[PDB]
Structure 1
Amino acid sequence: SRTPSDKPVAHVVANPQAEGQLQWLNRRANALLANGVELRDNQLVVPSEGLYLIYSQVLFKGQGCPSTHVLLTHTISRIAVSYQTKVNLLSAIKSPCQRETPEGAEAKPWYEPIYLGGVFQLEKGDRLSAEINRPDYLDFAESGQVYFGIIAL
């Protein structure tokens, strides 16, 4: 360690060895978590009140979606000390299969990424969480395909 550098910061990436779950990690190469940011239950805990930049990306992969009725979601939520209800700050939905379902052929690997980012005023003790409804379609194979992070502006 040479130069100090500061601000609450976090850039966590999904655990590749979790398969059917999205577990956030910080001890893996180009990942960061320092200066007060806590990771409790896959939740980032704000250490100080101020303006933050919140972002997250998720990559979905399925092997030839046979079901027209497929819905993929990705949302970053906030539970604050002032108002103790989970509300979505950033949200996105994506329909991966436009009915087109493989009939007389073989599998069709589809990939769908979703990216979210925004600036918010957060308070001390706020709990941020990035979650998806289909954690069985997670593709954490490669490296920077799924992540979640904040930086104090």
Structure 2
Amino acid sequence: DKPVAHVVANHQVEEQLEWLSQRANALLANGMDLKDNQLVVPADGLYLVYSQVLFKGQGCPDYVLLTHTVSRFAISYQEKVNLLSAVKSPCPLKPWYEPIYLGGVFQLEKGDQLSAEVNLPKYLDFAGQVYFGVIAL
């Protein structure tokens, strides 16, 4: 009955975090739509909003910071605003893996567009459990 979305990273397009709706364990239902890499809410309501990303690296040659952010572009406030955000400094040539997982509940309105992105897609890990999802409560 209730709008849901679970979209996953496109592995074939490294250098950009591109969300896919038809894929490994991926879904888009009951009005949830995916336009311009943004999930779009089909009705005012409460929503669980979540995203995970997995960052891979062999050594820390030059110093890296990773950011991961889920953000809302509301009809009510027509500017991009952070809902969930995190920063990590994975720098420990030893290999490293760093996940980042965000989740929260949010009141949203029909037409609001949610986006989930990172600063450095090249560091993402093709491996699927990179996902971005929305569930209407």
TM-score interval, smaller chain: over 0.9
Aligned to 1:35: 30
Report the CA distance between 1:29 and its aligned residue.
Answer: 3.4
**Length-normalised TM-score, structure 1:** 0.86
Name the CA distance, whole Å, in 2 between partners of 1:112 and 1:120: 26
- CA contact 2:8–2:132 (8 Å) conserved in 1: yes
Report the CA distance between 1:31 and its aligned residue.
Answer: 1.0
Name the CA distance, whole Å, in 2 between partners of 1:120 and 1:26: 22
Matched, 1:130 2:116: yes
Report the CA distance between 1:108 and its aligned residue.
Answer: 2.2
Count of matched residue pairs: 137
Identity %, equivalent residues: 79
Aligned to 2:76: 82
Name the CA distance, whole Å, in 2 between partners of 1:131 and 1:30: 19
**Deviations along 1:42-80, whole A, 9 cap, x unmatched?**
100010000000000000112211123x21101100011
Report the CA distance between 1:21 and its aligned residue.
Answer: 1.1
Q: Structure 1 residue aligned with 2:50, among 12, 36, 55?
A: 55
Matched, 1:64 2:59: yes
Name the CA distance, whole Å, in 1 between partners of 2:83 and 2:98: 21
RMSD across aligned positions (CA): 1.1
1:18 partner SS: coil
Is there any run of 5+ residues in structure 1 with no aligned partner, and where?
A: 1-5, 99-106
1:97 partner SS: coil
Is there any run of 5+ residues in structure 2 with no aligned partner, and where?
A: none
Task: Compare CA radii of gyration and give the structure with the larger one.
Answer: 1
Aligned to 1:120: 106
- CA contact 1:67–1:97 (8 Å) conserved in 2: no
Name the CA distance, whole Å, in 1 between partners of 2:115 and 2:54: 17
- Structure 1 segments, 4+ long, off by >6 Å, are none
Name the CA distance, whole Å, in 1 between partners of 2:79 and 2:2: 27
